[PDB]
């Protein structure tokens, strides 16, 4: 972005600043909040096992067995090619389950057994 000579700051639609001008050097650098999201714990029944996976929602696998899905970064979950009925919905077509030795896994959920008439 190009600032007019008297313009110094940049106000976002909520009074937060997206862009700015430094006193020491006049070069203008835009500002973005570091990162934020929602930590979710994918677990089976504690009666069954105590292994867990942690999904950092809506973020990459850099800011945080680190499969990177569209829901966010999945840590601790094994990626399995096989599809199954959705047991724990994660999002964006990804569901998790606890299956056999036993561990939690993440897969693209199956919409049902295919058929043809």
């Amino acid at each position: 972005k190009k600032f007019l000579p008297f313009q110094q700051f940049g106000r976002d639609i909520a009074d937060t600043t997206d862009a700015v001008r430094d006193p020491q050097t006049l070069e203008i650098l835009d500002i973005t909040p570091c990162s934020f999201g929602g930590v979710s714990v994918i677990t089976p029944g504690t009666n069954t096992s105590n292994q867990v996976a942690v999904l950092y929602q809506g973020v990459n696998c850099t800011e945080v067995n680190v499969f990177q899905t569209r829901a966010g970064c999945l840590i601790g979950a094994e990626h399995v090619n096989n599809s199954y009925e959705c047991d724990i919905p994660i999002g964006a077509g990804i569901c998790a389950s606890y299956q056999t030795s036993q561990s939690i896994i993440a897969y693209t959920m199956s919409l049902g057994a295919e058929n043809s008439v």
Binding site: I13, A14, T16, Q57, G91
Partner: protein
């Protein structure tokens, strides 16, 4: 033109395909209340902690709303336990389904109408969560429902998918609306051509008019307006010296910075409660729409509804689903009687002093002769003892007319 002895009976009909758009799901917006109210400010966070559960229960309500959105989508579209597929040969008796069937050439497995539908709809602690089912999965579900309807009629809904030739399925649909199934086979090419033309007009009808997808676009616009208003509320002072929390923290020592932060906290918490209440009400409306859509997919698509105007204007024949961003579109194929003629009628016919009533249909007269026709389509037949039944006499029925009833056994006996 009402009179006590006149009826109008259709002589010709048309296939009508109408479009019904129903919203199914909202955008899964999640709001971090602490970040919205106290952006990385321990002083504010400690002050907000004094309000107890006001903050967490808003997040709980929004999480419930998002789960309900996924549940709505699943209820509407995941009505079939198997993914059915159409045969590579489209020998459907002249009926052309290529405009609603998935297109393999396209990167996505969407029908042309589905792509037309999709092309016509458009950092403050706020995040959006992706839906559990992607657009391609909704397209797969709609394709499975479409293949089931095309190749098995209503059988794939009740039990296992039983194949049936599509013209025979249309004959079933004919008998469902009270029109004899020979009308289909005698007019199969005309019916197929009218159906194909009606399907072809749907693209133009949706594409030309830019407000055709108004329901889904209004849902999106309402959600965007709510989010924008929630964001804009952060610039309000609410009586404090500055709407910027960092400015108050930098300018004031805690003893009065806490008063200013308390004013800001009150204002922003009220804004969050307002937003969550409006979201809950709108989610209730969307859930009602999704329940209606699921009922329509069960009764209009998986079956043949007899409910008037439930599956569009006219006598329902079938419906086809199409995915759409945040919703579903039903193409309702119905019968509309087109050309009619004005005949004279009689409630019964006096043959030998006995009154004859039609087993199915109505007695009509073309000026001089009397016939019996099916109610919804003009098809005159000779009045015989195999078309009529006997009950009572001619001294009881009001308006009975003298005529002759043919007995097919008499010339067989004579010959």
């Amino acid at each position: 033109a009402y009179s006590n002895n006149s009826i109008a009976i259709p002589t010709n009909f048309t296939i009508s395909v109408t479009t019904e758009i129903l919203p199914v799901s909202m955008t899964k917006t999640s709001v971090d209340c602490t970040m919205y109210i106290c952006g990385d400010s321990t002083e504010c966070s400690n002050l907000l902690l004094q309000y107890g559960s006001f903050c967490t229960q808003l997040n709980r309500a929004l999480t419930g709303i998002a789960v309900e959105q996924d549940k709505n989508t699943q209820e509407v579209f995941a009505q079939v336990k198997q993914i059915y597929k159409t045969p590579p040969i489209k020998d459907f008796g002249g009926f052309n389904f290529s405009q609603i069937l998935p297109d393999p050439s396209k990167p996505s497995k969407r029908s042309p109408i589905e792509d037309l539908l999709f092309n016509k709809v458009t950092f403050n602690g706020l995040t959006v969560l992706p839906p559990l089912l992607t657009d391609e999965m909704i397209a797969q579900y709609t394709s499975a429902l479409l293949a089931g309807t095309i190749t098995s009629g209503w059988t794939f809904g009740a039990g296992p998918a039983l194949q049936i030739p599509f013209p025979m399925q249309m004959a079933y649909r004919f008998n469902g609306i009270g029109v004899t199934q020979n009308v289909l086979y005698e007019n199969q090419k005309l019916i197929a051509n009218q159906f194909n033309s009606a399907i072809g007009k749907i693209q133009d009808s949706l594409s030309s008019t830019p407000s055709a997808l108004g329901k889904l676009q209004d849902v999106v616009n309402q959600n965007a307006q709510a989010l924008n208003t929630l964001v804009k509320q952060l610039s309000s002072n609410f009586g404090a010296i500055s709407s910027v929390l960092n400015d108050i923290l930098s300018r004031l020592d805690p003893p009065e910075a806490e008063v200013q932060i308390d004013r800001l906290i009150t204002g922003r918490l009220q804004s969050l409660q307002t937003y969550v209440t409006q979201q809950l009400i709108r989610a209730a409306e969307i859930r009602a729409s999704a329940n209606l859509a699921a009922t329509k997919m069960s009764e209009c698509v998986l079956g043949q509804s007899k409910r008037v105007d439930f599956c569009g204007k006219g006598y329902h024949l079938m419906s086809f689903p199409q995915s759409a961003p945040h919703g579903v579109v039903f193409l309702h194929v119905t019968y509309v009687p087109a050309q009619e003629k004005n005949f004279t009628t009689a409630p019964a016919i006096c043959h030998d002093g006995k009154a004859h009533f039609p087993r199915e249909g109505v007695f009509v007269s073309n000026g001089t002769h009397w016939f019996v026709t099916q109610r919804n389509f003009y098809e005159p037949q000779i009045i015989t003892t195999d078309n009529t039944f006997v009950s009572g006499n001619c001294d009881v029925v009001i308006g009975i007319v003298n005529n002759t009833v043919y007995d097919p056994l008499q010339p067989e006996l004579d010959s």
